[model samples]
Structures are given as C-alpha cells and as structure tokens.
Target: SDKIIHLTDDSFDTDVLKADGAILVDFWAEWCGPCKMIAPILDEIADEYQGKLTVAKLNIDQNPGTAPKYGIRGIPTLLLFKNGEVAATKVGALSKGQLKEFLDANLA
Candidate 1:
C-alpha cells in the first residue's frame, strides 16, 4: 500500500504543481486537530487511489512559501492540483465518500 508523501517547498513544484496526474495536497500543521483527524483518511486515499492520483501532505508550519502562494488560511486546507494549476479546493475535514466525490467530480 502506498503511504502519503511528505512534501516541502523545494519539492512542491516538481511533486505536485507539475505532476503528471491529479494531486491532492493536504496543507496542515501538527497541532491542528482537524488536520490530525484527516491524516489517516488521506493515507487510505493514497493507498486506494494508488496510481490514479498522488497524495501529498505539506506541513504549513515548516513549508511557509507554498501555502501562502495558494492563499491557505485554514490548517486543514485541501488543494486538488491538475495540470499545474488548482482544480478544486476544500477546507476542514470531510468524510471519505465526500473526498472521493470531490476527486471524481474534478478529475473525471
């Protein structure tokens, strides 16, 4: 099973922004309750989606530049990137079905 990737400012562009397929970036902090709540769900998504899409986690506390560029004001901000641009964005926590719906609605 594939684990969620830890992304940083240096790797954000290459790993996500310009990724070949759709990528979900979870912008969060360690101390964020909602962030922690969604972490395992994202891991399951990464494993289930496998080759279809890429799942990455960016620590907002550590990687400063990338989050601000996307105007992330919330800790559990989720950005769906496709073809080097933002396709969709979600804030706070969501159920697995809702997340999958967001992905399929956008990626399809």
Candidate 2:
C-alpha cells in the first residue's frame, strides 16, 4: 500500500515547509514516466520511517507555483526538507538503496 501524501501549491506550506522533522517532497507529474518509477520505492521508505519521516508528492503539471519556486526544472526531483528548509535536493530517479542512503545521511 502507498502511504505517500500528495501535495500541491495550496498545501505545500502546511504539509511540508512548516512540518516537523524530515519531509521528502517529490516533484513529478502523471506524464512523467521516470516519476512513476519512483513511486513504489518512496512508499516503502514511508512505511519504514513511519513517524520519523513524511514522504510527499507534488505534480508540477498541476501545481506550477510550487515547483519553479524551488527551481525544479526536471521530473522526479526529490527535495529533503528539514526545519522548514531544503537540506538536500536530488534530481532524477534513484534506487531504494541510494534513496535510503540519502535519507540516512540527512535524517541523522
């Protein structure tokens, strides 16, 4: 089951920017093939982390304001947010191990 929460321009601040602890926001769209590939992996991460992290998604095709404000030029951009700011930004798809590695370092 997917536990990922979908975010948009309207809910971006309350759900991500002002959120507690770590939040991973994936910038993507339905038309993005690579973006769809990252979905299941993120869901696994969400299940593992539970209360430790909140995994979210934002469709650039729908929410135009949020993506460009954060300089998301490509699909499948993962932004790790901590304490109301972006701590790490990764562009493109990543394996579960690679994504966990990224999370392990920053969430530490």
Best by TM-score: 2
After superposition, the stretches of candidate 1 with alpha carbons farther than 4 Å from their true spots are none
Whole-structure CA lDDT of model 1? 0.85
TM-score of each: 0.92, 0.95
| Local distance difference test scores for all models | 0.85, 0.88
Model 2 lDDT, full chain set: 0.88
- Model 1 clash pairs are none
How far does residue 86 in candidate 1 sit from its true spot (Å)? Answer: 0.8
lDDT of 1 by residue, 1-108 (tens): 256778999998888877888789889988888888888889888888878878888998898887779998887998988867888989889899999888889888
In candidate 1, position 14 carries an lDDT of: 86
| TM-score, cand. 1 | 0.92
Model 2 RMSD in angstroms = 1.0
lDDT of 2 by residue, 1-108 (tens): 465879989988898889887889999998999888878898999999888888998998899898779998887999999866898999999889999999999998
